[PDB]
Amino acid sequence: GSSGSSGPESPLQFYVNYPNSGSVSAYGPGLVYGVANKTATFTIVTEDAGEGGLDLAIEGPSKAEISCIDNKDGTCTVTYLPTLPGDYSILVKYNDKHIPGSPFTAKITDDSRRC
Template sequence: MSDIEVDNINVFGPGLVEGKTGKRCLIYFSGLPINSDDSSADLYKDITHTIEGPKNPEIIFDFDRLNEDNNVEAYYVPLLPGDYKINIYFKKQLLNGCPFTAQIIGKPVSAEKLIRKVQVFGKASSLGRALIVNEFLVDCSKVKPVLGGLTVHVKGPVRSSAHLDIIDNRNGTYQILYKPILPGTYNMDIKIADTHIPGSPFKIRVLDRSNSIF
């Protein structure tokens, strides 16, 4: 992807002009060739965006395939009506045509209702051990339309912390891995679109590594 220049990338689509609350607002990119020799992960890093509006949604990209017009497809789901200012960057350079202003109409949509089908699997969401990697699964595959990825924040007891990793399985599920350094009670916030998923914040009891309860 290093040979792609910002002037060769075109961004267009109805989602840059208008849309409805709770619906996918589509955006298309040309000039981003995707094939077996290219790394989609590089594009995730190189393309960034900002959206300013009544509630700022996340743009979701599908870099694994091209649509029937050989364009990369992306979308966002606004939850509140109003004007949204959209800037999209490639390697921190603003794409041609930015900023775009999209006028969103419709009734306010509750993020809580959209994500109520999220499920959590694995006892490590409530019980873990210190000094080892604990893992559980968050299943968002039934959330339609997808509002965005997970944000996770964990806070431990005083003078304690936990190393945290989030693995996007690219199928609507996420593996949450955390390694606390000390026993104690840890609080973990897991959100989508700045909204807690069911069960969040999670209160996790972390025991000593050698505890026989496991």
């Protein structure tokens, strides 16, 4: 036996989204964990959310700098570099409304000695 269909299709291919369902999430090896004095970045999901105002701020045992970047492809790119190993309290807000899942907890370590 064998089966398989190409599938339906229509012209003026146009897909519209509704505001009803609109949420922003964040994931990546930069929010889960990291390495002292090591490059760490993560990605953020956001499509047709609304040009409002994204704010990012991380806390912990040491103040870390943030160079969040705004892209126009599909997701944003935020790069940062830790100063000391420890649980960093990442905080992200969207249009005066925290994101579903925050604050986030990342487990960063330190690798200096050459094992």
